[PDB]
């Protein structure tokens with residue numbers, strides 16, 4: 311699993327066209343104030359152990375930033391070892407569920423299988439942009 | 447070299463604190479309208495051949511999107527095989543120079559060695575977010 315953590319002042323997205331024949335989540339749009347935005351690329355080897363490590367890490371980082379909103383944003387572009395779309399969707403559902411057991415704030419999982427527009431205002435402090443890898 | 451291509455309606459950044467002992471570029475800030483924003487991670491094996499392939503690709507993609515501004519945005523977070531900071535800075539200067547020989551619009555290389563805030567409004571069409579690898 312490859313993640314990018316962006317500490318945002320604000321974030322919003324809108325699904326536009328479908329990117330899979332039948333996107334497994336409905337279309338939608340949402341906007342947020344301050345948040346940790348986690349761009350999340352699910353990889354071929356990812357399983358339950360991977361999901362739990364990433365959930366732990368996201369919670370730990372969120373705590374250190376003092377953020378109370380996490381956005382789990384599915385993202386196909388951070389890796390060249392992608393899991394197939396249905397497995398990736400399952401692992402993202404699992405990550406959202408695991409994160410809720412470790413982090414007390416708002417957890418928003420953005421819809422999977424859509425092309426999306428987005429806007430982000432990313433903070434510029436030293437911990438505002440980090441990347442992470444998890445495996446098992 | 448690992449790149450992320452984001453087709454933006456607007457982009458802006460500001461250097462904040464230095465991220466290297468002596469950043470090789472001055473502090474600064476800039477904002478743009480529609481542009482191709484290229485987050486660029488220089489990797490250990492990158493040399494002149496790599497730079498030329500990436501410059502060709504960026505020009506080709508820009509043409510297909512009908513964009514007339516490219517932002518070359520140094521980014522440490524897209525790879526786990528980073529070139530050292532001074533080599534990365536040299537390859538980014540080279541990429542900017544090579545791109546000008548292939549693409550006729552505005553080429554802006556953002557300062558290297560700074561933590562930066564940024565804001566982007568990324569389009570949501572099917573070619574608005576792509577990633578690329580180059581090697582030699």
Ligand SMILES: Nc1ncnc2c1ncn2[C@@H]1O[C@H](CO)[C@@H](NC(=O)[C@@H](N)CO)[C@H]1O
Pocket residue numbers: 329330350351352353384385386387392393394395398421422423424425426427570575
């Ligand atoms: N292995 C994987 N890891 C994470 N997300 C994955 C994935 N495989 C498919 N997706 C999702 O399907 C959309 C089309 O690739 C993806 N959409 C996107 O990546 C948008 N940000 C493009 O605008 C994403 O929702």
Ligand SMILES: Nc1ncnc2c1ncn2[C@@H]1O[C@H](CO)[C@@H](NC(=O)[C@@H](N)CO)[C@H]1O
Pocket residue numbers: 434439465466486487488489520521522523528529530531534557558559560561562563
């Ligand atoms: N191998 C490499 N490829 C691309 N850029 C590289 C690099 N090694 C160092 N940098 C630059 O040094 C700043 C601190 O890592 C980096 N700064 C950043 O990546 C900001 N976006 C953080 O706010 C970047 O300017």
Ligand SMILES: [Mg+2]
Pocket residue numbers: 324325337338339
């Ligand atoms: Mg809509």
Ligand SMILES: [Mg+2]
Pocket residue numbers: 460461473474475
């Ligand atoms: Mg300033």
